[PDB]
């Protein structure tokens, strides 16, 4: 806890505003208050005159739609001196330093005599406020000119909290009274006197716009306008009583922008409404009670951490929108009522205002989700979560924050089509003051209802919505809007639910004698798309049908059809970004591949069933030693192979799946390792013999393995199943491990580091490989979108020639980080969201100082507890102590399976490690500079190939796509298994050997999959090299240079680049075509 | 165009 407390204090002092810029502002707006008093009074006027008073003035009054007309504006207008006051966070002294800039809210209370008791009807009082604001702006401008301050002051109108009904004046300073350096700007809020209108008449259920329907938004707008100072004094006493109010406020302040939460309007579409005030007001309600027994949930002696924790706990578990609502007394213990108003509500009986009116139903659940998931991290003790909770902005990119995004282009966008304007209709102005608010609610309801359980959260955002307009104009002007609609287009942003996202059918109400109301809305909403259909269980229900596609999800089809039918037949729905990523995933050569969804693992399952058939044959067979167990460890068994398995597609490098066979423990094993394996091969030899005899339909052949260095006797059996799949078999022996432990002990002290490396890769293939597949296969079920993303990440590595040095496991452990550790984000449910998160993590990963450790567990045991946790960092510190620069090891990837942390990240050259991080940052920077689109995505997935010193072009004799199982084909294995060689791509093997010969000087790379990244025909592959700095320049020759060099002087040599090329060309033979140096 | 990054061999990029 002490670490967290000090982290808070460090965080505060970083964000504390500088007191000098404070003293500068009070110098200004104190003088501004003198200007306010200078303004003269005014007499009673009608709308007809004031239009003539403002007809020629530069100022124009900001009437709110519907503007007063001469008939209904018989009310008169007058101005009188206001009661100048300062409110907001600045009044409470709870503000912080903001690079974008902060705001000072000063309130002007119009005198009570300017109102009649019934002026809260039909926008009566508001129109008085608008002219009052306008009359101020006229006199402020001339008095601003008189005092010569206008040179560095810019004045513009704006809407308070993006509320169209509350225009306000905006005072900002451009580059003695100049406060531009302060990054502060004053807001002029024209509020009403307290208790001008009976608050009972202004309840959310009541109405105040005659046409009856309730008007919660307008009722709050007027009533909130009359209640500003009252909540100031309410917050003031709480700050006095509890010492940690301001500290808790600023922690809540910071948490909000990281999640993109503000006090602005949300019914318009923007995520927000919850600011400091809604945070701080909820503090006081809970400090005064909050429980179902009116018991205090927060005690005034609580520290900053405890005050913040309870509310993050409060918002997380108590529901304030659908079932339950909280009431408190500003002027009386706060009580949690079980009844709910179906909208977020924090009622105040003293003031009769619901502060949570600005909260949309959709945003509240999103808010509740963030509170709950932070509470889990707040309770977390194993890992420090201070940076994630506070020092990480999740709102920078919508795609990273939100799984799917659809942008909808409404028709005729210098006004909306007559039909769409007609749909808004008179009935909804009273309910929803602006069309932007109405259309968002229309889009949410149809989109929410159409998708249903397929999604978790839905957000509708009005792209290009402005809130500030010049004083010369009455209402904000959008270039597309034409003073009609303040937006460019709407974007439908979704949090999809992986469990039921790809469900082929949307279940509806059951059949009955009399069509029920739920059935009524069900048939009407989907129309022809609706149908009554029966299932195997015998249930009769109304249902609609969708068709899966390998390019798009079912959601794109639903949102398109649902939105066109209800909102507008002319709208255009397009999400091409997700389409590109789906296409970049290879399309297998299986029946109905195009119709198959990206979440379907049928291809992997058919491989397992074929293995099961061979799994039975091997056991019933009689051997000198009984078979203990057969453990498949291949990539396809863990749903990670770059291309899905295809029958007889043996050009796929992943065609042969590793399988570990272990026989029963015996004491007759040879104690000599070369004798040990020749006994191992003698097993597989017998397995081949009776397998050939008893089951002739299976074909088999042996091959050598050289993955373990110096262990040149390993022989593996490759079994070609009749189904069209290949399996590769190797022995595991209990003696094998200890012999390697014997191997390290006897070695000379100089050779021991080399031998342990041999042991490291042995356990990576034999011992730890079993554990990696077991855990990953189980965890993959919970993370439905882990399967698609990891291939696309590996596909991305192959395009940039990184898979050759990166073991497949390391990519998997990297790709799973956003899921077991999704904070501060949510678990991805989309291919684009999951992939970009992997790229983001690499961009911000400091592998020199920050270790990567994961809990390979299903979502909330095997979780890392504190003792095992601390052990792993202690390993990282010890390794970094010996390797501070990280030259020997770069990525420290550890887990329960790998506590050492060096198992799957050893042997990678430093250039490749920096290249991996280099591409990720440029990828993130590319997304920053240019938003996600088709051109960027192609730019992400294409290789530069220029920075490489020399580039070698290869072309295979035949196209390898069709034998690789990729749809732009063999149907049986060759009669002679030697013919298999003719249809392989060896370039992955070629590069490996040349690395060994030229490790000291060159780093060659090649594309491991040629069928996927080999152009149209999948026959083109490239070898790219790099000359190290030392041998790039001239060197004095020595027997230990260990390089191919040419003499220049008697005692100097230089790299012989051309001789290297000829060796590559001869070794490539016909495959090599062109050389670029 | 292409996603091209200067090769860093001193780990200076991090």
């Amino acid at each position: 806890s002490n670490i967290f407390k000090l982290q808070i204090d460090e965080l505060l002092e970083q964000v504390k505003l500088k007191q000098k810029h404070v003293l500068k502002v009070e110098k200004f707006l104190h003088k501004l208050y003198d200007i306010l008093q200078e303004i003269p009074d005014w007499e009673e006027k009608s709308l007809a005159e004031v239009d003539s008073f403002f007809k020629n003035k530069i100022v124009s009054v900001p009437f709110v739609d519907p503007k007063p007309i001469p008939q209904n504006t018989n009310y008169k207008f007058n101005y009188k001196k206001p009661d100048i006051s300062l409110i907001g966070s600045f009044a409470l002294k709870a503000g912080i330093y903001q690079p974008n800039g902060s705001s000072i809210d000063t309130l002007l209370t119009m005198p009570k005599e300017l109102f009649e008791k019934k002026d809260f009807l039909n926008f009566r009082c508001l129109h008085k406020r608008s002219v009052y604001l306008a009359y101020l702006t006229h006199h402020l401008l001339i008095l601003l000119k008189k005092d010569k301050l206008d040179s560095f002051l810019q004045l513009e109108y704006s809407y308070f909290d993006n509320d169209p009904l509350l225009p306000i004046l905006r005072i900002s300073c451009s580059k003695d009274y100049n406060f531009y350096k302060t990054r502060f700007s004053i807001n002029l809020l024209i509020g009403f006197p307290y208790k001008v209108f009976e608050p009972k008449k202004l309840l959310p259920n009541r109405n105040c716009i005659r046409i009856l329907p309730a008007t919660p938004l307008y009722n709050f707008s007027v009533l909130s306008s009359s209640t500003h100072e009252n909540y100031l004094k309410y917050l003031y006493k709480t700050k006095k009583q509890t010492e940690s109010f301001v500290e808790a406020t600023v922690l809540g302040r910071l948490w909000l922008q990281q999640r993109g939460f503000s006090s602005n309007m949300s019914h318009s579409g923007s995520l927000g409404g919850f600011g400091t005030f809604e945070f701080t007001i909820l503090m006081a309600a809970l400090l005064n009670g909050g429980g179902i027994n009116s018991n205090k949930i927060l005690l005034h002696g609580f520290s900053s951490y405890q005050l913040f924790k309870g509310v993050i706990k409060y918002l997380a578990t108590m529901d304030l929108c659908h079932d339950g609502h909280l009431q408190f007394h500003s002027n009386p213990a706060s009580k949690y009522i079980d009844e709910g108003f179906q909208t977020p509500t924090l009622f105040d009986k003293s003031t009769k205002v619901n502060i949570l009116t600005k909260m949309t139903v959709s945003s509240y659940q999103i808010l509740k989700e963030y509170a709950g998931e932070t509470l889990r991290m707040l309770n977390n003790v194993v890992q420090d979560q201070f940076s994630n909770i506070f020092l990480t902005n999740i709102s920078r990119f919508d795609n990273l924050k939100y799984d799917l995004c659809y942008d909808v282009q409404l028709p005729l966008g210098n006004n909306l089509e007559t039909s769409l304007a007609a749909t808004f209709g008179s009935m909804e102005r009273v309910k929803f003051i602006t069309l932007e608010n109405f259309l968002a609610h229309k889009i949410t309801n149809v989109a929410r209802y159409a998708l249903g359980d397929r999604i978790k959260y839905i957000q509708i955002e009005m792209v290009g919505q402005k809130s500030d307009f010049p004083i010369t104009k009455r209402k904000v002007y959008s270039n597309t809007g034409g003073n009609h609609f303040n937006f460019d287009f709407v974007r439908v942003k979704l949090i999809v639910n992986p469990s039921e996202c790809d469900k082929l059918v949307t279940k509806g109400p059951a059949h009955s004698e009399t069509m029920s109301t739920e059935a009524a809305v069900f048939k009407n909403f989907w129309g022809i798309k609706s149908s009554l259909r029966r299932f195997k269980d015998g249930s009769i229900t109304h249902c609609c049908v969708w068709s899966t596609s390998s390019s798009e999800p079912i959601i794109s089809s639903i949102v398109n059809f649902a939105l066109q039918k209800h909102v507008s037949k002319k709208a255009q729905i397009s999400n091409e970004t997700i389409k590109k990523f789906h296409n970049f995933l290879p399309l297998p050569n299986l029946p109905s591949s195009a119709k198959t969804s990206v979440l379907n693992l049928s291809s992997f399952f058919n491989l397992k069933k074929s293995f099961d058939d061979l799994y039975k044959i091997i056991f019933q067979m009689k051997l000198p030693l009984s078979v203990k167990s057969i453990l498949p460890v291949g990539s396809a068994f863990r749903y990670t192979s770059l291309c899905q398995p295809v029958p007889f597609a043996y050009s796929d490098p992943d065609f042969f799946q590793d399988v570990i066979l272990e026989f029963e423990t015996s004491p007759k094993w040879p104690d000599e390792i070369t004798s040990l394996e020749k006994a191992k091969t003698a097993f597989l030899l017998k397995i081949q013999e009776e397998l050939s005899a008893n089951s002739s339909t299976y074909r088999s052949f042996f091959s050598r393995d050289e993955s373990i260095p110096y262990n040149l006797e390993i022989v593996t059996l490759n079994i070609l199943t009749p189904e069209g799949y290949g399996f590769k078999f190797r022995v595991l022996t209990e003696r094998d491990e200890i012999l390697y432990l014997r191997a390290i002990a006897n070695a000379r002290n100089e050779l021991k580091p080399e031998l342990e490396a041999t042991f490291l890769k042995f356990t990576a293939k034999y011992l730890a490989s079993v554990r990696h597949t077991r855990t990953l296969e189980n965890i993959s079920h919970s993370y439905q979108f882990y399967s698609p993303v990891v291939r696309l990440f590996k596909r991305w590595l192959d395009t940039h020639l990184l898979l050759g040095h990166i073991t497949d496991e390391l990519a998997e452990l990297i790709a799973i980080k956003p899921f077991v550790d999704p904070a501060p984000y949510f678990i991805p449910g989309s291919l684009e969201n999951g992939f970009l998160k992997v790229l983001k993590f690499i961009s911000q990963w400091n592998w020199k100082d920050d270790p990567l450790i994961l809990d390979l567990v299903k979502p909330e045991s095997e979780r890392l507890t504190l003792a095992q946790y601390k052990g792993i960092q202690m390993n990282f510190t010890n390794l970094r102590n010996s390797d501070p620069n990280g030259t020997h090891l770069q990525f420290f990837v550890a887990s329960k399976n790998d506590p050492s942390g060096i198992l799957y990240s050893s042997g990678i050259p430093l250039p490749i490690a920096t290249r991996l991080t280099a591409l990720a940052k440029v990828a993130v920077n590319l997304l920053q500079t240019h938003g996600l689109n088709q051109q960027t995505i192609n730019l992400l997935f294409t290789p530069g190939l220029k920075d490489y010193d020399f580039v070698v072009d290869l072309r295979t004799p035949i196209g390898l796509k069709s034998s690789c199982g990729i749809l732009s084909a063999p149907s049986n294995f060759p009669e002679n298994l030697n013919d298999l060689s003719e249809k392989m791509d060896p370039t992955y093997q070629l590069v490996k050997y040349l690395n060994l010969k030229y490790k000291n000087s060159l780093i060659l790379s090649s594309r491991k999959y040629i069928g996927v990244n080999g152009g149209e025909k999948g026959d083109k592959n490239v070898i790219t090299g790099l000359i190290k700095p030392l041998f790039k320049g001239a060197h004095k020759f020595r027997v230990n240079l260990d390089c191919n060099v040419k003499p220049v002087d008697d005692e100097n040599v230089i790299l012989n680049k051309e001789a290297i090329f000829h060796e590559i060309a001869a070794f490539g033979n016909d495959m090599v075509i062109n050389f670029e140096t | 165009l292409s996603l091209s990054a200067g090769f860093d061999w001193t780990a200076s990029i991090l």
């Binding site: 091959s703 060689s981 191919n1044 | -």
Partner: protein
Amino acid sequence: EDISAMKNGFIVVPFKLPDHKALPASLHFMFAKRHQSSNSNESDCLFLVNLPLLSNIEHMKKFVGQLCGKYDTVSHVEELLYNDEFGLHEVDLSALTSDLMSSTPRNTALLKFVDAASINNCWNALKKYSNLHAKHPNELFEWTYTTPSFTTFVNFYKPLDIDYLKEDIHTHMAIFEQREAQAQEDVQSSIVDEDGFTLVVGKNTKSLNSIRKKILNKIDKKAKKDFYRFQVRERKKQEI
């Protein structure tokens, strides 16, 4: 171009590279010096550096044969010792774990010859060969980069012969069993030192080499603080 010998004594031995379409007078340079060593198998050897890719013994037979014809010198290469282009054989794992079945720089190798008459013939030819590069580079020799061993190497995805494997395993097990049998008898044969010291050997032991490795690999509690006159007096001293 003028360089014929390094100051340390390494004679430069240029070769012409093949003509390939991908690579449109490119040369490869090999550095050599006499190798001196009292050991017999390394005697009559020529130390070589910067060997071409996959240079087996046959590659030097052609090269020395070219040298023999051009300089009418008699030289025969016996074998190329220490040829590890990819470092597979740098460590002998068989010898290290156990002594049974195995009693045992880089980019360089030792080129053994039949007799001292051959090596002095070749090294004189190598000097004259080096001088060619300065005056007439055209008559330099050409390295083929292709041999039968090359083709076997190039065909990586070849199923081995099952019949050949059967014989190889059968020979290897039989030899191991004889050696293992002999080792087990030796330990459990009542070994006695010349001074009549009978070595102790535990049951299930198989190799004396293992016994040595264990020897290499590998009163306070019963003492009483208060038993004697002086002890309690020491306690008595500390007590006060």
